[PDB]
DNA sequence: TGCATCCGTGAGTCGAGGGTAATAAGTTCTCCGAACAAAAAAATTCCAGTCCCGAAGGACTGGAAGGCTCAATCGATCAAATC
């Protein structure tokens, strides 16, 4: 098996377990290759992050979550892979220039 | 015209048990023919013997293609804090 179809099975991987506690860890375990062996093979083909990759659609996923539903911020810390709203709210102001509370009021 | 003659008829099945018996010659003499014999094929059963893409199979050569340790240094995780 060729290397370009692996990835289309990692991106055929992750969607589907988003609102579970994932980790890197349990897909090397799936993938059966080393932690370290993801890392080197994202950057033949899409040039970007694969270990910021979980965490960036955490972000996009609570973008339709938080905005759809009624739930409030704080349970997605413990869930989407931090700890507390202080570190979620700064990786948004890298990525789309906003803060979480004014991008629903944003019609 | 009888009178005298004769042909052609008569319920249906189960059965129950099988078929007799009379007297009747001899001689030689001789071709027509049998099955056993006893060969003479011819037909099969047997037995090794050369050919040929495959025949269980090993190896080879060849490009491809593979798993996970570290370490400067990035970025962001964690956790007191703080508007």
Redesign the pocket.
Known sequence: ???QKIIQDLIAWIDEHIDQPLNIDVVAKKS??????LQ?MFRTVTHQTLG?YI?QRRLLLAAVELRTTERPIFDIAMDL????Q??FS??FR?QFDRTPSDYRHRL
């Not at 892979?81 to 507390?84: E, L, Q, R, T, W």
Request: charged residues 30%.
């Open positions: 098996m060729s290397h059966g290759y080393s932690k370290w062996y080197r910021d965490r892979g931090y700890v507390s202080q570190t700064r990786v890298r």
